[PDB]
Structure 1
Amino acid sequence: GLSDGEWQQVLNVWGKVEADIAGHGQEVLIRLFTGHPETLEKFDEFKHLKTEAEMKASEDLKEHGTVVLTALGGILKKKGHHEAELKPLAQSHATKHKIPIKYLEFISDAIIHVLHSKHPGDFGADAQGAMTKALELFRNDIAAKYKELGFQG
């Protein structure tokens, strides 16, 4: 878990994302898809957008980016008390979408990358630590539901 000062760091960082969630959203997805091309194949609407330029030119991709970060903001504000919100997600990602936990690791690393890239010199060492921890927690709670379901990857 995180200390209250660590949660207060995470929610301070999140305020910066909220200035523009769609712009952050699209950047996260592009880092994901360009860094790990295998992840794109999981998206039936977007698997034709293989390069960063093609990705950028899709408003459908940006709206998907919005849905994702808005789900995650919602969860971060629960300061770890998120069992009712995480259950559906883990269930749909394991059984409908068939998303290995390794992809969740990719996307968590993509968020850190994007925060340093969009806010150079404004994303402190302390801030990085707290955000990393929150994302670990999120991934670990999902990993527990995946094991329940025997979702092997």
Structure 2
Amino acid sequence: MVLSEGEWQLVLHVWAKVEADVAGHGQDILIRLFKSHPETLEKFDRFKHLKTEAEMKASEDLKKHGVTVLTALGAILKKKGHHEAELKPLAQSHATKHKIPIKYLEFISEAIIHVLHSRHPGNFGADAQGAMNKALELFRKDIAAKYKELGYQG
């Protein structure tokens, strides 16, 4: 997959909006993931005691982890597909330490798109959604290729 220069422009335009409130976006994306797919919460030893949305929103540590996640994803997207070097440490930890299937990356991709609609209702149209879906699919396909490079079936 290759994005047009126009599609990358759209992705980076949207990402400038996430960067204005990284902690808010990151907290919402993780809660959305955990509510929609509660099996993913069991992968987080630090958070799996949290049982309800209201407990999750009160967790300062969940919020900090949201910042960690979006900061790495942002550095990757700014490379406009030339991201091999940035992917390698991410693929390494998620395949070999956390043991996260690619399917769970599809679930967090759906949570990102849901939260971008919920936080930017007039600012995230069909064209920007299409470009972001393509950039996140590019990311998932390339990280699935790095899993295989490391010897894992994602």
Question: What's the TM-score bracket when you normalise by the shorter of the two chains?
Answer: over 0.9
Spell out, residue by residue over 1:52-97, the C-alpha distance to the aligned partner (whole angstroms, 9 max, x if none): 1111000100000000000001100000111111011111100010
Aligned partner of residue 63 in structure 1, secondary structure? helix
Which residue of structure 2 aligns with residue 6 of structure 1?
A: 7
Aligned equivalents of 2:45 and 2:85: distance in 1? 28
How far the C-alpha of 1:130 sits from its partner, in A, is 0.5
Q: How many residues align?
A: 153
What SS does the corresponding residue of 1:96 show, helix, strand or coil? helix
CA shift for structure 1 position 148: 2.6
Letter paired with 1:134: A
Partner of 2:94: 93
> Which residue in the other structure is 1:62 paired with?
63
Q: What's the offset of the Cα at 1:147?
A: 2.0
Percentage of identical aligned residues: 86
**Residues of 2 paired with 1:83 and 1:6: CA distance?**
20
Whichever residue aligns with residue 72 of structure 2, its letter is A
> Distance in 2 between the 1:151 and 1:55 partners?
32
In structure 2, the residue matched to 1:140 is 141
| Separation of aligned partners in 1, 2:74 and 2:39 | 26
**Once the 2 structures are TM-superposed, how far is the Cα of residue 22 of structure 1 from its aligned partner?**
0.2
Alignment of 1:2-151 (within 5 A): 2-151=3-152
1:122 deviation in Å? 1.7
Shift of 1:152: 2.9
Q: Which runs of 5+ in 2 are unaligned?
A: none
Q: Structure 1 counterpart of 2:8, which letter?
A: W
Letter in 2 for 1:13: V
TM norm structure 2: 0.96
Amino acid paired to 2:22 = I
Please tell me the residue identity of whatever aligns with 2:68: V
Q: After TM superposition, what 4+ stretches of structure 1 lie above 6 angstroms from structure 2?
A: none
**Which ranges of structure 1 fall in alignment gaps of 5 or more residues?**
none
Instruction: Give the Cα–Cα distance (whole angstroms) in 2 for the partners of residues 11 and 68 of structure 1.
Output: 17
Instruction: Give the deviation of 1:146 after TM superposition.
Output: 1.5
